[PDB]
Amino acid sequence: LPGFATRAIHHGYDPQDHGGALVPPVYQTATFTFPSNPTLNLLEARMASLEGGEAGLALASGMGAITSTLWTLLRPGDEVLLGNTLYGCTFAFLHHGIGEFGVKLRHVDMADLQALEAAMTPATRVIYFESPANPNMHMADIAGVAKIARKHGATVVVDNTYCTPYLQRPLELGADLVVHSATKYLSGHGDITAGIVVGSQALVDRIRLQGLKDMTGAVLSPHDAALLMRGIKTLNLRMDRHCANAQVLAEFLARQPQVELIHYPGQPGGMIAFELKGGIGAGRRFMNALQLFSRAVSLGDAESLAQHPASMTHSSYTPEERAHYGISEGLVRLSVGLEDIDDLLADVQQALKASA
Amino acid sequence: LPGFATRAIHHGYDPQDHGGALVPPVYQTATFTFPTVESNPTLNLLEARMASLEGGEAGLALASGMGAITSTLWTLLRPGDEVLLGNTLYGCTFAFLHHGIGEFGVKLRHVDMADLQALEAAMTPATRVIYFESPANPNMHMADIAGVAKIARKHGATVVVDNTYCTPYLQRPLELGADLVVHSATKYLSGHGDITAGIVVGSQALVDRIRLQGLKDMTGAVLSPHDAALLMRGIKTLNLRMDRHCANAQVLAEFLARQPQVELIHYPPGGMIAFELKGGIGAGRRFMNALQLFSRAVSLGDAESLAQHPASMTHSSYTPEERAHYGISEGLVRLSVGLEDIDDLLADVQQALKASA
Amino acid sequence: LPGFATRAIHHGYDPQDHGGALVPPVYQTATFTFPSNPTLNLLEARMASLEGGEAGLALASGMGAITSTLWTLLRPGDEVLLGNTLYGCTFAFLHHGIGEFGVKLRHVDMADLQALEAAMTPATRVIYFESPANPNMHMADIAGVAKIARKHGATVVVDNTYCTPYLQRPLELGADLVVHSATKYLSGHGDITAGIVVGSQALVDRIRLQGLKDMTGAVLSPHDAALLMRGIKTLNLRMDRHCANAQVLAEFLARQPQVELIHYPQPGGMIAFELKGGIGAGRRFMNALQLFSRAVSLGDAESLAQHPASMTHSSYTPEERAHYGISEGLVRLSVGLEDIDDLLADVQQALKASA
Amino acid sequence: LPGFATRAIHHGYDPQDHGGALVPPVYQTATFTFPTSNPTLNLLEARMASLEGGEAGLALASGMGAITSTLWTLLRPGDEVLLGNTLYGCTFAFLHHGIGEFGVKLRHVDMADLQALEAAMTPATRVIYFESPANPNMHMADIAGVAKIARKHGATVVVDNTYCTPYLQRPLELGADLVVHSATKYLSGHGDITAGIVVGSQALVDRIRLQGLKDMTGAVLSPHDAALLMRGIKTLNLRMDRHCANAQVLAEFLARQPQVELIHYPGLASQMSQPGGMIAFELKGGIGAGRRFMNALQLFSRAVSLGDAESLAQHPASMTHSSYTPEERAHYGISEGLVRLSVGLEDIDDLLADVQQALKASA
């Protein structure tokens, strides 16, 4: 089996099947003569290879991947066990979407196999969670969850967006399906939105012909698929740099007097979350002071991003409501990019002093 | 109000807000800086322009026509609600209803939209959505949208019309009373068969809900800015292309109606034609095999002429009786007449018909 | 032979050769395995078909097409006969570019065969001109020029940008090569820059392997080539509308008191007229336009307008402008595809504001 | 001054000037409203200028577009151009079968030998053009030294920096006047676009833009390709680091193989200054061994280019120069067993395995 880097650049493609083109031609065509799109097929095969899965499916967005998958596997009466902490729109989709169509939802600490097995019911059909989780980015025992899951043949779905198949491969640990917001690290350059699902040919075929075909129509543009593949070609190199930069920044943040503590890392790629002693006011001043980090909500970009939930995404909520969603007043999340670490340290240092 | 052609080229865009660029820059970016309080311009422009063409208040762009339909229905319906559908629908749409949302507690009921008497009789306190294509198979008969709208308001039912076949250039359901219009922009709107996309147009209130609920939470069927830019490029020639599609189809239809191999012409709806081959399924296969200009494919609204014979193509797996149940006769042939020289199209059909014998 | 519209949509392509794709896949690859780019090849073959020529060549821009062609055909000592009036960038290329490398240039009235024949010398190798020409868009006898060129086997090159192969095909009239700024009508949507050269395989091969390969490197991106082919698919329909709109606007402008006369028209959707009020009227006219865009180009879906004296040639003096065939009140319009009633209304109010 | 990686990702762009977009919008428009420049091209140019330490940049349709636009601008009949002993195939063709046929005098000189260069300087010398490093051993030239001589008659020094990229070498900070790049290679890094870049003083670049490009080549770069090039530049430092590491391991391996006569370049660790991920070696078995070696490769691609994520290999004698005779090839610096490799970003163990088996098959 060729190495990860080799497969991320070559898997599934041979120039002679496409006129000798070194780079695969982009099949920007809505239709083909009556007897699949070669560009999407290649992306799917390559992502399947990287995750150690049998088949892949490309979608218009990470949400397209999650919804197409869940709509396929669940029906009224079925139960879904969810990790305690989820993205945002995922939490919304579950509670304000599919959850309002008869599907039962139950949040459980995936870190406690005792509680998980205790929450297992003959109606449980799907176990969905992200690894690691937002809190302190704890890994969670995927193999352990898989063991409990098969009690009622429950399908285990893991959101592997944060790690990418380069750092974690849930399928090799027992998961049935892995989903990605390829919009983040996989693309790596913040210019496209895309989603990926990988698992057995059996499950993926169902999601493709049911969830996607009939219930979401969340198809991915061949042009975007081509750009996503371009990004995947440097995945290993980018993740290495994201991790190194984040490690240095995390160690720096831990020594600063303005920082109460570091939620993570203690590695979640280039992600960091820390707490400002000064709370919401300190967070606002910190964000206003940044000159290199961008004030935005996303991650996995070449550019470093920063967000202060309390004054940004969750500014409308009250302090108590924020706490209920695991959002402290001084919580700051960073997607450390690929810039020179010395410039990133200087930016954070200056902003930290300005936060006072 | 500026003319249709003018709005299809200019509506919603002013070069001054984008560096003086004659053609709007493509915002191929997944994210924007977070609002200071102290949306993607490419998608917003496409949405505003399509809203203008349909005479609606707001527009929403989706990854595909199916993305538009599903995002809309997931938003408006919940378990217990009822949806009245036209008797004949698109394949995937039909499937989405019965094999998709229909399996989540939503009741579906098929009724002849051309029969207002029957429609009114099918209205129940639970009816929340009335969905149909106009025109619809098998004879592309234009349903009375204003009449349906009158009945719908009896229980505040939302009327949704699939306007793919006509495009806003030939029909504008919202101006006739519909609440929402959906499009597979993959067809005529794009016009060049290189992109897949969907559009929903209606009131700001309804579109906002579909955007923030059906799309944001239940489908994630977002449209790529690159594809949106291409769709807008296509819309710039919509009037001219539809004019030619129609002219070519009229000539081919008249020709087909006089040929010995043709039993009848179902229709004439843009450049769409559907006719019956006396020879049935075998004649259909030979006809399809003989075509040299028309392409054997399943779609429509492309610059290239397309042809399909359902019985030996999309519905080849079904039995003759099952096909009939789905409005598919053994000799049914559907044509999406393109923009090629009509003399070349006539010659291709003529020789194929002779070969069908 | 299939009709023009049919060839503009299908010529040179068969889905079977590319995975059954209805639309040709875009070969956005800089390299191919060691034994031509299928996307560029297709564009070239299709343009050759539309012009009635044997071969085509795609370039990064119209200027790329002209320079690549001339650098190939000329060498120090050779003479080039040029039309009395050219684009602008071309005129500069000739005089401030290739002309400073030993190549002799000589302007001649292509409409005057006697003068052209009299300007023919044993050193003449290329006869280059636009048809129609800027002045009053006078067609000019291409077959006549071709007969004279033979005298010393001179190569006749015609810039067919204004007409497009849909309205004029110089090769079928005797020209050796045709060049295009595909940036204009061929693309039709103002989103790409590109050039095209069509002629015999013999000539195009030389231009491809000499002018382009060695002297300009003006290659066209497969992405742009694909967009250009997308545009060509509606060429006949767009040109029909450009022409119809322009005819109506031309008739209107002729009856307006603010207009001295119409230089032209038919040159596609192009119109040129003179404002009685000179440069001041021109400036006010341009400032008032709300639909037409103040820009320098043509062949776009959007209508464009320009007043040379206050725009491209504003730095020159009135006498210098005249030397370049630019009058103080000259206004050029590239009539687009918008609703003619909206275009008439915009021009009408602008003309009243020009006073 | 921000670090290289920071500038390669951010230089010249502020989201607030473009609707807050994190990624710059692509200005795919042929024209703009008449005033009272394309932002996408301008950004690419400013960023490349920053990376090379130059004042201004210019983007072209191809590396050849960059070279021709530059030379057409700077030379006129009677002028003399001093060239490096060995030049890139097409560049050599442009000089001899192109501009060289328009009254411009050409003359090759060993740039590594300042004595010969200084002796080759004439009152007519206007341009000194060369690649650094250059074949056959990829030896670095003393740019500062060449610059000192050039000033004798105000000759403009132009350096093709394609092989190194501004990440590994910056000729302008060494005295060069202009640097040109075939961005088609390393800068893009993914083999999906063709593009050229020129960086130098605002004065020189303005002239090339308004004369060579505007009037003599028309080799403009598509905004779409410019955007892709910028996307590629964002990982330049990381890719070059891997290209270099992979090439070093493969070079050491090749140096120990019985089928290999010698390694032209790179030359051990620290022929100094590794030529990116480029390697050239000689096969003892000549043209026959070269053909078999090439036929056997299963991971490396048989193609003519470099700087791609995918590893490429070529054997000139049986590929680009197959029509020539053995003596003619020698005249062009091509040995019968010469093999050039553009080592890519794949797993080094897979690359080693491929070369290993192809080498055994070459016997």
Side-chain angles (χ1 to χ4, degrees):
Chain A
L1 185 275
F4 188 97
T6 304
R7 291 177 286 119
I9 295 167
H10 294 283
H11 190 81
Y13 185 69
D14 182 356
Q16 299 322 299
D17 282 57
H18 298 280
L22 179 58
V23 179
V26 185
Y27 283 76
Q28 191 66 27
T29 182
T31 324
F32 293 77
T33 54
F34 195 93
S36 60
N37 189 111
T39 297
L40 279 294
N41 290 328
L42 180 58
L43 166 64
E44 292 165 352
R46 188 164 295 174
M47 211 66 101
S49 177
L50 301 183
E51 284 286 3
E54 175 171 41
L57 182 65
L59 299 307
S61 69
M63 287 298 316
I66 299 174
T67 59
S68 293
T69 295
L70 298 181
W71 279 131
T72 297
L73 310 174
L74 302 155
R75 282 297 183 287
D78 291 347
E79 178 191 65
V80 183
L81 282 299
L82 307 163
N84 286 316
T85 298
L86 285 299
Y87 180 30
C89 289
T90 60
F91 179 77
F93 163 52
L94 298 167
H95 290 282
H96 298 79
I98 188 170
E100 300 189 348
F101 286 84
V103 178
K104 299 184 69 296
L105 298 63
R106 281 188 53 64
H107 291 279
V108 303
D109 183 357
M110 294 299 162
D112 175 38
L113 289 58
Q114 291 62 289
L116 178 58
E117 181 164 295
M120 286 297 278
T121 67
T124 304
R125 290 290 172 288
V126 173
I127 301 306
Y128 178 99
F129 61 92
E130 61 173 61
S131 174
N134 295 302
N136 292 62
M137 286 303 160
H138 296 301
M139 301 167 270
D141 197 322
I142 293 175
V145 169
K147 176 274 183 58
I148 299 173
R150 56 185 58 180
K151 180 179 187 177
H152 285 300
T155 301
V156 178
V157 184
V158 180
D159 185 333
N160 194 39
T161 298
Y162 302 151
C163 308
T164 83
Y166 178 63
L167 303 181
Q168 171 178 265
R169 292 180 287 289
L171 299 182
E172 312 191 319
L173 299 171
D176 291 287
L177 293 160
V178 293
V179 294
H180 288 95
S181 166
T183 304
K184 313 318 198 309
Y185 291 114
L186 291 172
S187 159
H189 301 67
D191 50 0
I192 64 176
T193 295
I196 296 286
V197 178
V198 176
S200 64
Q201 188 72 231
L203 286 168
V204 178
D205 280 352
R206 289 169 62 200
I207 298 171
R208 174 193 296 284
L209 305 169
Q210 295 170 33
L212 170 61
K213 172 185 171 301
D214 296 343
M215 291 178 280
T216 68
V219 64
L220 182 64
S221 171
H223 170 273
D224 283 6
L227 277 177
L228 175 50
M229 286 188 275
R230 194 180 201 269
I232 288 162
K233 293 191 179 178
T234 54
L235 183 63
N236 61 305
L237 307 183
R238 293 183 292 98
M239 295 311 291
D240 284 349
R241 186 51 58 97
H242 282 299
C243 296
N245 277 175
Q247 301 174 204
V248 174
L249 187 52
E251 297 184 1
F252 172 74
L253 287 164
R255 306 181 306 172
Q256 307 317 106
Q258 295 88 182
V259 183
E260 185 61 54
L261 54 69
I262 302 182
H263 299 298
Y264 61 76
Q267 184 188 182
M271 305 302 291
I272 298 176
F274 66 98
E275 187 68 27
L276 281 172
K277 295 180 175 178
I280 201 167
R284 285 175 173 132
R285 291 190 291 280
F286 177 78
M287 294 302 304
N288 286 171
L290 296 171
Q291 294 175 297
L292 184 55
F293 272 76
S294 297
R295 293 171 275 282
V297 57
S298 188
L299 65 316
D301 290 358
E303 296 85 4
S304 291
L305 311 171
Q307 63 179 288
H308 175 229
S311 69
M312 288 168 70
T313 56
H314 298 63
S315 59
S316 67
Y317 295 115
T318 65
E320 187 170 358
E321 301 184 312
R322 282 195 282 276
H324 185 60
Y325 297 156
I327 299 301
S328 46
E329 302 302 272
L331 173 67
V332 175
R333 295 166 174 168
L334 303 179
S335 171
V336 185
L338 309 176
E339 303 94 337
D340 192 301
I341 187 61
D342 289 331
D343 294 330
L344 294 176
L345 284 166
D347 196 31
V348 176
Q349 179 188 182
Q350 203 253 196
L352 234 36
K353 288 173 184 169
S355 74
Chain B
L1 181 67
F4 189 94
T6 304
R7 291 180 282 116
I9 293 164
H10 295 281
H11 190 80
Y13 186 67
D14 178 4
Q16 282 295 308
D17 294 70
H18 297 283
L22 281 177
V23 173
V26 184
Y27 284 77
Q28 184 74 193
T29 184
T31 316
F32 293 77
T33 54
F34 198 92
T36 300
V37 193
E38 181 178 0
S39 60
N40 189 111
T42 295
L43 292 175
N44 294 329
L45 179 59
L46 164 64
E47 292 165 351
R49 189 164 295 173
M50 211 65 252
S52 176
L53 299 181
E54 285 285 5
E57 173 172 46
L60 180 64
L62 297 310
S64 67
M66 286 301 314
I69 299 169
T70 59
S71 296
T72 295
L73 299 182
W74 279 129
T75 299
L76 307 174
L77 303 155
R78 281 299 182 288
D81 291 348
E82 165 182 286
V83 185
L84 292 180
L85 307 164
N87 290 313
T88 59
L89 299 169
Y90 173 51
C92 295
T93 60
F94 181 79
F96 164 49
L97 282 292
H98 293 283
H99 299 78
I101 188 175
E103 306 195 335
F104 286 84
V106 174
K107 185 176 183 299
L108 309 176
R109 214 288 225 298
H110 286 281
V111 301
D112 180 355
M113 294 301 154
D115 180 1
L116 295 178
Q117 299 77 292
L119 175 59
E120 182 165 296
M123 288 293 280
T124 68
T127 306
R128 289 290 176 286
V129 174
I130 296 177
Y131 180 97
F132 60 92
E133 301 171 1
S134 177
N137 289 298
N139 293 294
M140 284 302 114
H141 286 167
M142 22 62 252
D144 191 326
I145 298 174
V148 171
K150 165 280 181 185
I151 296 175
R153 55 173 172 58
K154 299 311 299 178
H155 283 304
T158 302
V159 177
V160 186
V161 180
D162 185 331
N163 195 40
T164 299
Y165 304 148
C166 307
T167 82
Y169 178 61
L170 301 182
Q171 175 180 267
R172 291 177 289 292
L174 299 182
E175 312 193 316
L176 290 299
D179 289 287
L180 291 160
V181 288
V182 295
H183 289 275
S184 164
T186 305
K187 313 313 197 316
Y188 289 117
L189 290 171
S190 159
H192 301 69
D194 50 0
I195 61 172
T196 295
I199 294 287
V200 177
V201 175
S203 64
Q204 189 71 235
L206 285 169
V207 179
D208 279 353
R209 288 168 63 203
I210 297 169
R211 173 191 298 281
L212 302 172
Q213 293 167 35
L215 171 60
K216 172 177 163 296
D217 295 348
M218 290 179 279
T219 67
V222 299
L223 180 62
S224 169
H226 171 270
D227 285 4
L230 275 177
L231 175 51
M232 287 190 270
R233 195 181 200 269
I235 290 165
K236 292 187 177 179
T237 53
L238 181 64
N239 61 306
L240 305 184
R241 295 181 291 98
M242 298 309 125
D243 282 352
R244 185 54 56 96
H245 280 303
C246 296
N248 278 172
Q250 185 66 52
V251 173
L252 194 55
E254 295 181 355
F255 170 74
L256 284 164
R258 309 173 316 191
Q259 306 312 114
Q261 298 84 185
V262 182
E263 185 62 56
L264 65 167
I265 305 299
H266 299 298
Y267 60 74
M272 306 302 279
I273 298 175
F275 64 99
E276 210 76 288
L277 281 171
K278 296 176 180 175
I281 202 166
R285 289 185 172 112
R286 293 189 290 281
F287 176 81
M288 294 303 297
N289 286 170
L291 295 172
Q292 297 178 301
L293 185 54
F294 273 74
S295 295
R296 168 196 183 64
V298 181
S299 187
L300 66 310
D302 295 356
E304 297 86 1
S305 292
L306 311 173
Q308 65 175 296
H309 174 234
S312 65
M313 287 169 73
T314 55
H315 300 65
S316 60
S317 67
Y318 296 115
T319 65
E321 185 167 354
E322 303 184 313
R323 281 193 283 275
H325 178 51
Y326 293 161
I328 297 297
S329 54
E330 301 303 271
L332 173 65
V333 173
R334 295 168 172 168
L335 302 182
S336 172
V337 181
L339 312 175
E340 303 95 334
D341 192 306
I342 185 61
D343 289 328
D344 295 330
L345 293 178
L346 285 165
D348 196 27
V349 174
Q350 176 171 290
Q351 64 83 31
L353 285 179
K354 196 173 67 174
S356 74
Chain C
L1 200 184
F4 190 95
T6 304
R7 292 179 282 120
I9 292 166
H10 297 281
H11 189 82
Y13 184 71
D14 163 50
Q16 302 285 173
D17 307 351
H18 298 273
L22 276 286
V23 178
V26 183
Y27 284 78
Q28 188 63 44
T29 185
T31 311
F32 288 85
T33 56
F34 200 75
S36 60
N37 185 295
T39 296
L40 280 293
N41 292 327
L42 181 59
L43 165 65
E44 291 164 353
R46 192 164 292 175
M47 214 62 252
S49 178
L50 302 182
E51 284 287 5
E54 175 173 42
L57 181 64
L59 297 306
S61 69
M63 287 301 315
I66 179 177
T67 60
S68 294
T69 295
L70 296 181
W71 277 132
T72 298
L73 309 171
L74 304 155
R75 284 298 183 285
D78 289 345
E79 195 177 314
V80 181
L81 294 183
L82 308 165
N84 284 171
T85 57
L86 296 305
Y87 174 33
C89 295
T90 62
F91 176 102
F93 168 36
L94 282 294
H95 293 286
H96 300 78
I98 188 170
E100 306 195 333
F101 281 95
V103 177
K104 298 307 305 304
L105 288 47
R106 184 180 177 68
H107 289 283
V108 186
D109 178 358
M110 295 301 138
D112 183 356
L113 296 178
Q114 295 67 289
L116 184 285
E117 176 177 300
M120 287 295 275
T121 67
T124 306
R125 290 290 173 287
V126 172
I127 295 179
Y128 178 98
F129 60 89
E130 300 168 2
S131 175
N134 293 300
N136 293 66
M137 287 303 141
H138 291 304
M139 306 159 278
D141 199 325
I142 294 176
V145 168
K147 179 178 174 295
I148 297 174
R150 308 285 179 55
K151 184 179 182 60
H152 290 92
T155 300
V156 176
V157 184
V158 180
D159 185 332
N160 195 38
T161 297
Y162 303 149
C163 302
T164 83
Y166 176 62
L167 300 181
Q168 172 180 264
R169 293 180 285 284
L171 300 182
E172 312 191 320
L173 299 178
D176 292 287
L177 293 159
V178 292
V179 294
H180 290 274
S181 167
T183 304
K184 314 311 202 306
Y185 289 118
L186 289 170
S187 158
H189 302 69
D191 50 1
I192 61 169
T193 294
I196 296 290
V197 176
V198 174
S200 65
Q201 190 71 239
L203 287 167
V204 177
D205 280 355
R206 291 168 63 203
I207 298 171
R208 173 192 296 285
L209 304 167
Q210 293 169 37
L212 170 59
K213 171 181 167 298
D214 295 346
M215 295 178 275
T216 65
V219 298
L220 180 63
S221 171
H223 173 271
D224 286 2
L227 277 177
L228 174 52
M229 287 188 273
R230 195 181 202 267
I232 288 166
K233 293 188 179 178
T234 55
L235 182 67
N236 60 304
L237 304 182
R238 292 184 291 99
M239 296 310 293
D240 284 352
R241 187 52 57 97
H242 280 299
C243 293
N245 276 175
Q247 178 75 195
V248 175
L249 263 186
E251 288 299 304
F252 174 74
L253 287 165
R255 316 191 312 287
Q256 302 320 99
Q258 297 85 182
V259 181
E260 180 55 49
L261 69 175
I262 306 181
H263 297 295
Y264 60 75
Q266 30 191 293
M270 304 296 281
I271 299 177
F273 66 101
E274 187 70 23
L275 282 171
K276 294 178 180 178
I279 297 200
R283 289 189 171 112
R284 289 188 293 278
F285 176 80
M286 296 301 301
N287 285 170
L289 295 171
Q290 299 180 299
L291 182 54
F292 272 76
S293 295
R294 179 156 176 287
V296 180
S297 192
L298 62 105
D300 291 357
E302 299 86 4
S303 291
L304 309 171
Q306 61 179 298
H307 175 233
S310 69
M311 286 167 75
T312 54
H313 299 61
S314 60
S315 62
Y316 297 118
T317 63
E319 186 167 356
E320 301 186 308
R321 281 192 284 270
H323 178 63
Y324 293 166
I326 299 302
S327 44
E328 301 303 88
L330 170 68
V331 173
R332 293 165 176 170
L333 304 180
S334 173
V335 181
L337 309 172
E338 305 97 328
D339 193 302
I340 188 61
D341 290 330
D342 295 331
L343 294 176
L344 285 163
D346 193 31
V347 174
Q348 177 171 288
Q349 62 86 196
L351 285 176
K352 293 198 306 174
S354 76
Chain D
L1 202 190
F4 189 96
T6 304
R7 291 179 283 121
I9 290 165
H10 296 282
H11 192 78
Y13 185 71
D14 180 66
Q16 300 312 294
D17 312 309
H18 298 280
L22 260 43
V23 177
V26 184
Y27 284 75
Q28 189 67 41
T29 183
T31 330
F32 293 76
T33 57
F34 201 94
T36 61
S37 300
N38 190 111
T40 296
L41 275 51
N42 294 336
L43 180 60
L44 165 63
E45 291 166 350
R47 191 163 291 174
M48 276 303 299
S50 176
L51 301 183
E52 284 285 7
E55 175 174 41
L58 182 63
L60 298 308
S62 66
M64 182 63 32
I67 299 172
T68 57
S69 294
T70 296
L71 298 183
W72 278 131
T73 299
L74 306 172
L75 296 298
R76 283 297 184 289
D79 289 346
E80 150 184 337
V81 180
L82 294 181
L83 303 166
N85 70 304
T86 59
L87 303 173
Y88 171 88
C90 196
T91 298
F92 175 101
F94 166 51
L95 281 296
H96 290 287
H97 298 80
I99 187 172
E101 304 196 339
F102 285 83
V104 178
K105 181 171 178 296
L106 266 53
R107 39 185 306 186
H108 296 276
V109 180
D110 179 354
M111 353 70 244
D113 177 32
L114 300 180
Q115 294 63 64
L117 177 55
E118 184 167 297
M121 290 295 279
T122 71
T125 305
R126 288 292 173 287
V127 172
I128 296 177
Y129 179 95
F130 61 92
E131 290 160 38
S132 175
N135 299 301
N137 299 292
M138 215 60 92
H139 286 303
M140 302 292 261
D142 190 323
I143 296 174
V146 172
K148 198 158 192 174
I149 297 175
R151 293 181 174 64
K152 176 185 301 183
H153 288 299
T156 303
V157 174
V158 183
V159 180
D160 184 332
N161 193 39
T162 299
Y163 304 146
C164 305
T165 83
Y167 177 63
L168 303 183
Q169 176 182 256
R170 292 182 283 286
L172 300 181
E173 308 187 326
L174 299 177
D177 288 288
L178 292 161
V179 289
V180 292
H181 288 274
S182 166
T184 304
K185 314 312 201 308
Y186 289 115
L187 289 170
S188 156
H190 303 68
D192 50 1
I193 60 171
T194 296
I197 294 289
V198 177
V199 174
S201 62
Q202 192 69 234
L204 286 168
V205 176
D206 281 353
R207 291 168 62 200
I208 296 171
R209 174 191 296 285
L210 304 170
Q211 292 167 35
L213 170 59
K214 171 180 166 299
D215 299 347
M216 294 180 277
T217 64
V220 298
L221 181 63
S222 172
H224 173 273
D225 288 355
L228 274 175
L229 176 52
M230 286 190 273
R231 192 181 204 265
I233 290 166
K234 293 190 180 175
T235 54
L236 182 65
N237 61 306
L238 307 183
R239 293 182 292 96
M240 295 312 288
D241 284 349
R242 184 54 54 98
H243 276 126
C244 293
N246 278 175
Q248 179 67 196
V249 174
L250 192 52
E252 294 178 357
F253 171 74
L254 285 163
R256 302 185 290 81
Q257 305 313 109
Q259 297 85 182
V260 181
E261 181 68 11
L262 70 173
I263 304 296
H264 298 82
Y265 60 74
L268 63 72
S270 60
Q271 62 185 184
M272 302 172 269
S273 181
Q274 309 296 293
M278 296 171 81
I279 296 178
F281 65 99
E282 190 68 33
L283 280 174
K284 296 178 183 177
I287 200 166
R291 288 188 169 98
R292 291 189 293 281
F293 176 78
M294 296 299 301
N295 285 168
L297 295 169
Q298 297 178 301
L299 182 54
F300 272 76
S301 296
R302 296 180 274 285
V304 56
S305 191
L306 63 90
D308 293 353
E310 297 84 7
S311 295
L312 311 171
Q314 59 178 292
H315 174 236
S318 66
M319 284 161 246
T320 54
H321 300 67
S322 58
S323 63
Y324 296 116
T325 62
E327 184 170 353
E328 301 183 312
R329 280 194 284 275
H331 177 58
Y332 294 161
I334 298 297
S335 300
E336 299 303 272
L338 172 63
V339 174
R340 295 167 176 167
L341 303 181
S342 173
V343 182
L345 308 174
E346 304 100 328
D347 190 306
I348 186 61
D349 293 332
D350 295 327
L351 293 178
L352 282 170
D354 196 31
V355 175
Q356 181 187 184
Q357 65 80 31
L359 234 35
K360 287 171 60 285
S362 75

